[PDB]
């Protein structure tokens, strides 16, 4: 299975700050990566998929970059509603696999 | 025309298929391999009297004569096939519209189809 | 995007019980359904792909079934390690999409 390595595990930052989360893949996955935001008690909600394609309703403050084995999720101007655990998930190969998550506190 | 693998990979890239509707380039190369063996002139008649045309074996039952608004001959050339495929993959079942892609390519290491080019 | 409707939302059960979870899809997704298990503070862990194929290390007590628009995860002889939140996820089309989850808690 493809192994995803996500960092950091957790971070705390202030409103308006830039925050950066990394996801490394064990092999080339092209751009077949999902970025999820999970609030307490809720299913993971998709923010970004493929080559930094934002889901409807997601603010432009979220952007994805990277390809191959090295991916970044950047949140520009962190806002209070951004409190969540964020996850990357590859869907390049079967089965899809998750990174370990990043807990974000604001 | 019989495309070489890398020749076709480059041409599909230039025609804008890389990550089109989220489908990485190798998907498209792989789908062509298993649909037409890279033969732009490939024609195969279906049981029902329709025919699948060209490099991506697009089916006249729905797509040409006509949802792509094209005569099927346009799909048998050394652009039309790419433009029609882009409509197809926006249409309903994504690349699953190509059964051979689903069975032979989906969820595999499709980057292999563009490596070494 | 494909909508996945998962039921029940929550349930409580005892060790040795059978648990049955349903996932419906808004269109036909062939066999392309994942079942994930998530424990508190941890990432979702894939249990089943292709609706019924089990990951190595997952016991046969977990059974995935169904096809098309109608899928079921049946957990037989529930064990302590099974209490968690379960999610179905389609990967038939891009983007993948999640069911809303089922919280499986101790009686």
Domain positions in chain C are: 1-107
* Tokens 């508190």 -> residue: C40
Cis peptide before C47 (omega within 30 of 0): no
Q: How many whole angstroms separate alpha carbon A84 and alpha carbon A99?
A: 15
Q: Which residues pair with C62 in a beta bridge?
A: C75
Q: Tell which phi-psi region holds residue B49, choosing left (phi > 0), alpha (psi between -120 and 50) or beta.
A: left
How many Cβ pairs closer than 8 A exist between chain A and B? Answer: 23
Pair of tokens at residue B6: 């890398």
Q: This structure's resolution (angstroms)?
A: 1.7
- B-contacting chains (≥3 CB pairs under 8 Å): A, C
What residues of B are labeled active site?
Answer: 35, 52
Chain A residues with beta carbon closer than 8 angstroms to that of C4? none
Nearest to C64 by CA among C44, C85, C87: C87
Q: How many whole angstroms separate alpha carbon A70 and alpha carbon A22?
A: 8
C16 touches chain B (CB under 8 A): no
Cα-Cα-Cα-Cα dihedral sign, residues C49, C53, C56, C61: positive
Cβ–Cβ < 8 Å for A44, A36: yes
Q: For chain B, how many structural domains are there in total?
A: 1
Nearest to A77 by CA among A20, A18, A14: A18
Q: Which residues pair with C103 in a beta bridge?
A: C10, C85
Q: How many whole angstroms separate alpha carbon C78 and alpha carbon C107?
A: 12
Please report, for chain B, how many H helices and E strands are present, in that order: 4, 3
* Tokens 């998750």 -> residue: A98
Does the structural domain C1-107 have CATH classification 3.50.50.60?
no
- Please give the residue of chain C at the shortest CA–CA distance from A33: C95
Interface residues of A toward C, Cβ cutoff 8 Å, are 34, 42-44, 46, 49-50, 53, 55, 87, 89, 91, 94-101
Cβ–Cβ < 8 Å for B35, B55: yes
Q: How many whole angstroms separate alpha carbon C65 and alpha carbon C53?
A: 9
Cis peptide before A95 (omega within 30 of 0): yes
- C9, with CB counted inside 10 A (0-12, 13-18, 19+), is exposed
What kind of fold does domain A1-106 have according to CATH?
A: Immunoglobulin-like (2.60.40)
**What distance, in Å, lies between the first and last C-alpha atoms of chain B?**
19
Nearest to A1 by CA among A24, A39, A20, A27: A27
* Tokens 């909508």 -> residue: C3
Pair of tokens at residue C74: 């049946």
Pair of tokens at residue B84: 């029609």
In three-state secondary structure terms, C28 is coil
Other C-beta atoms lying within 10 Å of the C-beta of residue A81: 10
Q: How many whole angstroms separate alpha carbon B7 and alpha carbon A98?
A: 35
CATH code of residue B66: 1.10.530.10
């Amino acid at each position: 299975d493809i192994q995803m390595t996500q960092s950091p595990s957790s971070l705390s930052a202030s409103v308006g700050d830039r925050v950066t989360i990394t996801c490394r893949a064990s092999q080339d996955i092209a751009s077949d990566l999902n970025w999820y935001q999970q609030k307490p008690g809720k299913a993971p909600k998709l923010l970004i998929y493929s080559d930094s394609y934002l889901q409807s309703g997601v603010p432009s403050r979220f952007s994805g970059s990277g390809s191959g084995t090295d991916f970044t999720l950047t949140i520009s101007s962190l806002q209070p509603e951004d409190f969540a655990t964020y996850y990357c998930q590859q869907y390049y190969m079967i089965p899809s696999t998750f990174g370990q998550g990043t807990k974000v506190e604001i | 025309k019989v495309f070489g693998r890398c020749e076709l990979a480059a041409a599909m890239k230039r025609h804008g298929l890389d990550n089109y509707r989220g489908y990485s380039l190798g998907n498209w190369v792989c789908a062509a391999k298993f649909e037409s063996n890279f033969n732009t002139q490939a024609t195969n008649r279906n049981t029902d009297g329709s025919t699948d045309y060209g490099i991506l074996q697009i089916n006249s039952r729905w797509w040409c004569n006509n949802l792509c608004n094209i005569p099927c001959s346009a799909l048998l050339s050394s652009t039309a096939s790419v433009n029609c495929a882009k409509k197809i993959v926006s249409d309903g079942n994504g690349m699953n519209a190509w059964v051979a892609w689903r069975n032979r390519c989906k969820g595999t290491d499709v980057q292999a189809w563009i490596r070494g080019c």
